[PDB]
Design a protein around this ligand. Structure first.
Ligand SMILES: CCCCCCCCCCCCCCCCCC(=O)OC[C@H](COP(=O)(O)OC[C@H](N)C(=O)O)OC(=O)CCCCCCCCCCCCCCCCC
Ligand SMILES: CCCCCCCC/C=C\CCCCCCCC(=O)O[C@@H](COC(=O)CCCCCCCCCCCCCCC)COP(=O)([O-])OCC[N+](C)(C)C
Ligand SMILES: CCOc1cc(CC(=O)N[C@@H](CC(C)C)c2ccccc2N2CCCCC2)ccc1C(=O)O
Ligand SMILES: Nc1ncnc2c1ncn2[C@@H]1O[C@H](COP(=O)(O)OP(=O)(O)OP(=O)(O)O)[C@@H](O)[C@H]1O
Ligand SMILES: Nc1ncnc2c1ncn2[C@@H]1O[C@H](COP(=O)(O)OP(=O)(O)OP(=O)(O)O)[C@@H](O)[C@H]1O
Ligand SMILES: [K+]
Lengths: 356, 292, 50, 49, 361
């Protein structure tokens, strides 16, 4: 009616090719998916999962692990609805017994001094919360009244028990939902003691240190085996080059997670040519451990891409020895500076030792 | 009115989107109108400074400088040369940095950081671009014919003379074809020039001489210039040159450039030595080596 | 108003192209010129007034 | 699908060129498409009137 | 639009010729002729807008005037009048749009009729209706172009690693024979057998008329094939397309082909035949790569590419070309004259016929 398409012409057109616009936004998006995010939020599509049945315990568990403002709303609604539901049925019993009827001293009501639904709401509040003023109270010979009083008390006890349990476990567990572990955005490959080393920096933002910190580093690559095996995300564990060869690390001041790339190390063939963004060469560093205060084991994974690895760079020294204590300049924590270093391949570096 | 509010609001939004889409068409055309224009006409007195038509074919150069892709202009830098009427000043140099240097700068349709060109004493640069090109016959490289009146393709819009130019052009090339051409004076049905060959358009370029009595030819040979067609082209050109014309030729064909009175071998904006026999091919060790 | 604007606008566009330099034709693709001269012109000619 | 099975004879390529067949897809199919858009309205409009 | 596209295609010639002003006037005159027709569109669409915008008003005017003044059936109560006014709006949408429905139905009938005729047009022949290799055995040889009416081709009679070369004149059953062999011609009688050793399998093709897509240079050459660095470089060197792809503004990514970058007949023929070599199939069919090219040395480059490919793959190659540079050397010649096959005559067997052996050399 009020549209330009009152009659559609549908006439053919002859417009020559003009594809590329001024904006390069059409081809600008070229990001490649990663199975572990920088912030440690791994995201892998678990598509086509067999439908495991759902149980009411999952809903109950979801109540326990809810947030603080949501828990207050759930329990306030639970308390208010419980009082309101029982006030409604209290009103029914009084109505069905003639208590709500106009004044008559002959009969004894099932609940004394119950007149309107407002009194019924107040009576349910007094019974469930156990205030029990006594102006409105239960009487005898009304078996339904005794039965509902038992039901309301039993229901009130179970509701209160759930609230205490939910509150009790909230303070215990929700305190351990904070991740104060920071890695470096970009890792480096430097030349320490003559041997190439892949290094990254990790620090602790909480005064209480992580007890028994274990570090796990894994190279993820679609490594097709020479025999014919093909695996999309094969994980190769990498040693730590620690003082004892173990995975224990002390976290007081941030340190460099340096691993010497040797023949055993899969990074023996690492090159800046294969350092581009579209190369399947990704490092995963995981520092597990238990925080002393609470006792819950904590994990903080991080993923380093080839493009996020800066070849031939050195981490800035951090800890300055002041007169009394040690100064940590966390502003320059993950800042890497260049240094004159060999830029060949660690596999090709074996020739330098052979030549010398 | 409340009932109709619903559909009114929907169609106001829908038509607004349509106008937003269709107002981008005017935006695109305004971008096209924002393009620059070089020069409508020059700054000179049209009374006596110019002449009716340069039928001589003599050009004078005063430190010619050419420019294209202003970031770098390695072509035709401070080159000075003199024009001899009726001769064949061939131009053929490096394929990459010396082939189309002089050709681009000839018709003033390109930039020039410096330079000074005068034709027979009149100021070529100071004269209008259309006025300068009105009396400068040229030749093409690829066969292009404007569909429509084929006579209008050859004869000018003014059409000062029809039969004389028609007969002279026929004698120059394809006398039987031109005389027996069913198009005639009108020749409206060009049909994209399927009947005509590649070299036929070159005669139409030469028709400008019979059209405008222009001595200077801006020639160029490419796109399967056969030996027989070139010989017919050469025969017409030398006949015209003997009477009044002046020949200027630029091509990469070795045979066409070999039979040249002079040479203007250009490489990266530098012109090699010019001598009478093939620019002294026997003595020179550069042009002769590349020739074979 | 729509019809006379389209008639006036087309003439102005063509008169601007004739003044174009040689670098403009050698750099800008012909398809873009044809698009702005055919598709854009058709909309203003027919659909823009409606 | 009929195009794949079509014959490339001169009569089948001159009388009905590639442009004619391509134009049919553009113009004719769109016309049939729009009829199916308006088909329910064709049987309904008399009811409203 | 067709007139102006030809104008702007020859920008350099028109600009240098100083004929842009004269040719601009011709385009302007054509637009002036079209402007009269545009006037009708604009003038008569105003009537459509006016009729749509003024019919409901007129209907309301006559209804209320007639009911109140002339008929005087009853009073004009607000309830009945405005309920009827809303009914006028609701009922005037279909009363106005029913015309477009009828037009759409009429166009649908026309469109379906045209599509029905297209679906019942001529159709190609249905598939599957001691060489010791992929061979072509022809004995009967009774083919034709049109399904009926004056059959022309008759008595056609013609392994792997065989550089067969049919030689003949223009119109003497050369390209038609190859097309008939491909299975795209009409069969009258005979029995053509396709033997598959390495119903027919994939066949490379490069017809006399070059055919190109509108895609990148590599995309046009690949023809939906995986990119091979050595293979892609090898073919372009044989075809000498390196200078031609370099002059392109994008290099090897320009929109080469129809509705893309304009080219020349010789360049189109070279790239068309180049794609056939890249196909790398059990058989390769070619049709006069140098017919539209006057190249003197590119034939030698083609010979080097053909000989290298023939040695490497030994794929059957039928190079039907009229080039007299490699005609009698090591080629399985065969002559079909005046729209009829004559004999599969080898180089030694041709001297027995002694028809036109000396013409080539
Ligand atoms: C003096 C009075 C005092 C009153 C105070 C309170 C009295 C308490 C009495 C004790 C029994 C009450 C049961 C309450 C259960 C609370 C929550 C609970 O434990 O549920 C959990 C279970 C099972 O259910 P589910 O988890 O959803 O199971 C489905 C799924 N497969 C899963 O396993 O996750 O448990 C269930 O939920 C039970 C499953 C039974 C399934 C039957 C479906 C319909 C139930 C209601 C109708 C009963 C049948 C009709 C009876 C007619 C009688 C005339
Ligand atoms: C949240 C807090 C506000 C608490 C104050 C409530 C004020 C009284 C509400 C009200 O209108 O009650 C009225 C009814 O009302 C109903 O019967 C309502 C039933 C609602 C059921 C659930 C609603 C949620 C009171 O009516 P009654 O109890 O039937 O009065 C008895 C009649 N007599 C007084 C003459 C004897
Ligand atoms: C892209 C078109 O897709 C559509 C398709 C339809 C279905 C339809 O009958 N359409 C035609 C009707 C015919 C008779 C003109 C039409 C087109 C434009 C504006 C309004 C209308 N009339 C619709 C019926 C009621 C009055 C107005 C609806 C809406 C749309 C839409 O998303 O715009
Ligand atoms: N002073 C600091 N306090 C807290 N977190 C820090 C601090 N310095 C670095 N980080 C953390 O370390 C990581 C990167 O370390 P780096 O020193 O390179 O910081 P950055 O380059 O400024 O990082 P970003 O761009 O992520 O903010 C990030 O997760 C960042 O939040
Ligand atoms: N597609 C066709 N449909 C019908 N008749 C055809 C067709 N192609 C060719 N003909 C007819 O058959 C004759 C022989 O055509 P054919 O293709 O065999 O010639 P040719 O010698 O291969 O040609 P060319 O010089 O193009 O390679 C033509 O002269 C024409 O009369
Ligand atoms: K209490």
């Amino acid at each position: 009616m009020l549209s330009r398409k009152g009659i559609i012409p549908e006439e053919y057109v002859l417009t020559r090719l003009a594809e590329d616009p001024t904006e390069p936004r059409y081809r600008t998006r070229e990001r490649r998916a990663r199975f572990v995010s920088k912030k440690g939020n791994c995201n892998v599509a678990h598509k086509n999962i067999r439908e495991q049945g759902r149980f009411l315990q999952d809903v109950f568990t979801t109540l326990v692990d809810l947030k603080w403002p949501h828990t207050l709303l759930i329990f306030t609604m639970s308390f208010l609805c419980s009082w309101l539901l029982f006030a409604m049925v209290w009103w029914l019993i009084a109505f069905a017994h003639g208590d709500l009827a106009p004044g008559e001293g002959t009969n004894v009501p099932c609940v004394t001094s119950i007149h309107s639904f407002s009194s019924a709401f107040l009576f349910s509040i007094e019974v469930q919360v156990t205030i029990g003023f006594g102006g409105r109270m239960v009487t005898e010979e009304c078996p339904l009244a005794i039965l509902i009083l038992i039901v309301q008390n039993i229901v009130g006890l179970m509701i209160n028990a759930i609230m205490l349990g939910c509150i009790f476990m909230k303070t215990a567990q929700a305190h351990r939902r904070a991740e104060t572990l920071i890695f470096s955005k970009h890792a480096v490959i430097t030349l320490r003691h003559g041997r190439l080393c892949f290094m990254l920096r990790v620090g602790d933002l909480r005064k209480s240190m992580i007890i028994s910190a274990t570090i796990h580093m894994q190279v993820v690559r679609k490594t097709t085996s020479p025999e014919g095996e093909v695996v999309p995300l094969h994980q190769v564990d990498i040693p730590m080059e620690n003082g004892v060869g173990g995975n224990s690390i002390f976290l007081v001041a941030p340190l460099i997670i340096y691993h010497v790339i040797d023949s055993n190390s899969p990074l023996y063939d690492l090159a800046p040519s294969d350092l581009h963004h579209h190369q399947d060469l990704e490092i995963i560093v995981i520092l597990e451990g238990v925080v002393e205060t609470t006792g819950i084991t904590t994990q903080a994974r991080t993923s380093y891409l080839a493009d996020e690895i800066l070849w031939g760079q050195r981490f800035v020294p951090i800890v300055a020895e002041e007169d009394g204590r040690y100064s940590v300049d966390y502003s320059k924590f993950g800042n890497t500076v260049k240094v004159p270093t060999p830029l060949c391949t660690a596999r090709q570096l074996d020739e330098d030792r052979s030549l010398l | 009115y409340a009932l109709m509010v619903s559909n009114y609001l929907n169609w106001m939004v829908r038509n607004l989107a349509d106008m937003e889409i269709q107002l981008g068409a005017v935006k695109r055309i305004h971008a096209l109108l924002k393009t620059e224009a070089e020069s409508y006409e020059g700054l000179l007195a049209p009374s006596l400074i110019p002449k009716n038509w340069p039928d001589q074919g003599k050009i004078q150069i005063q430190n010619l400088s050419v420019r294209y892709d202003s970031s770098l202009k390695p072509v035709l830098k401070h080159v000075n040369t003199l024009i001899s009427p009726g001769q064949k000043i061939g131009i053929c140099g490096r394929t990459g940095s010396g082939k189309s240097s002089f050709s681009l700068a000839f018709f003033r349709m390109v930039d020039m950081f410096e330079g000074r060109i005068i034709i027979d004493g009149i100021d070529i640069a100071k004269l209008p671009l259309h006025t300068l090109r009105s009396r400068l016959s040229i030749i093409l490289q690829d066969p292009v014919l404007f569909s429509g009146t084929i006579r209008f393709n050859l004869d000018p819009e003014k059409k000062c003379s029809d039969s004389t130019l028609w007969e002279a052009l026929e004698i120059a090339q394809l006398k039987l074809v031109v005389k027996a051409l069913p198009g005639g004076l009108d020749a409206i049905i060009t049909e994209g020039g399927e009947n005509f060959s590649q070299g036929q358009r070159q005669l139409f370029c030469l028709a400008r001489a019979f059209v405008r009595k222009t001595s200077i030819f801006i020639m160029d040979e490419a796109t399967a210039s056969i030996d027989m067609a070139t010989e017919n082209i050469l025969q017409k050109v030398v006949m015209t040159a003997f009477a009044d014309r002046t020949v200027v030729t630029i091509a990469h064909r070795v045979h066409t450039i070999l039979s040249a009175d002079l040479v203007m071998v250009l490489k990266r904006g530098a012109i090699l030595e010019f001598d009478k026999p093939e620019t002294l091919l026997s003595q020179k060790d550069s042009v002769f080596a590349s020739f074979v | 108003t729509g019809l006379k604007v389209a008639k006036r606008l087309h003439r102005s566009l063509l008169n601007r192209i004739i003044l174009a330099p040689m670098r403009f034709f050698e750099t800008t693709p012909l398809g873009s010129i044809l698009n702005r001269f055919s598709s854009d012109c058709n909309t203003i000619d027919q659909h823009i007034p409606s | 699908n009929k195009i794949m099975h079509m014959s490339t004879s001169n009569l089948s390529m001159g009388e009905m060129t590639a442009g004619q067949i391509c134009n049919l897809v553009a113009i004719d199919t769109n016309q049939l498409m729009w009829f199916f858009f308006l088909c329910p309205n064709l049987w309904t409009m008399p009811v409203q009137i | 639009l067709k007139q102006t596209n030809e104008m702007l295609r020859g920008m350099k010639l028109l600009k240098l010729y100083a004929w842009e002003s004269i040719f601009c006037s011709r385009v302007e005159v054509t637009r002036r002729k079209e402007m009269t027709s545009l006037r009708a569109f604009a003038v008569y669409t105003s009537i459509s807008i006016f009729m749509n915008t003024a019919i409901p008003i007129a209907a309301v005017l006559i209804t209320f005037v007639g009911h109140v003044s002339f008929f005087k059936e009853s009073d004009l109560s607000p309830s009945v009048a405005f309920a009827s006014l809303s009914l006028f709006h609701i009922l005037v949408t279909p009363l106005f749009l029913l015309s477009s429905v009828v037009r759409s139905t009429v166009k649908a009938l026309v469109s379906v009729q045209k599509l029905s005729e297209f679906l019942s047009s001529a159709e190609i022949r249905e598939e599957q209706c001691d060489a010791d290799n992929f061979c072509v055995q022809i004995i009967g040889g009774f083919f034709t172009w049109t399904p009926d009416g004056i059959p022309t081709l008759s008595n056609i009679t013609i392994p792997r690693g065989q550089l067969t070369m049919i030689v003949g004149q223009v119109g003497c059953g050369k390209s038609s024979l190859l097309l008939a062999t491909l299975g795209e011609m009409q069969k009258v009688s005979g029995a053509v057998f396709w033997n598959s050793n390495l119903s027919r399998g994939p066949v490379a093709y490069a017809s006399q008329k070059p055919w190109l897509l509108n895609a990148t240079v590599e995309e046009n050459i690949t023809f939906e094939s995986p990119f091979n660095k050595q293979r892609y470089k090898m073919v372009i060197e044989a075809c000498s397309l390196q200078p031609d792809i370099d002059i392109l503004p994008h290099g090897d990514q320009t929109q080469i082909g129809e509705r893309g970058i304009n080219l020349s007949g010789g360049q189109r023929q070279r790239i068309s035949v180049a794609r056939a070599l890249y196909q790398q199939t059990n058989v390769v069919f070619l049709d006069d790569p140098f017919s539209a090219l006057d190249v003197h040395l590119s034939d030698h480059l083609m010979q080097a590419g053909i000989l290298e490919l023939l040695r490497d793959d030994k794929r059957t190659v039928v190079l039907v070309t009229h080039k007299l540079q490699y005609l009698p050397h090591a080629d399985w010649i065969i002559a079909m004259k005046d729209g009829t096959i004559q004999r599969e005559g080898t180089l030694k067997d041709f001297q027995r016929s002694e028809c036109q052996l000396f013409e080539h050399w």
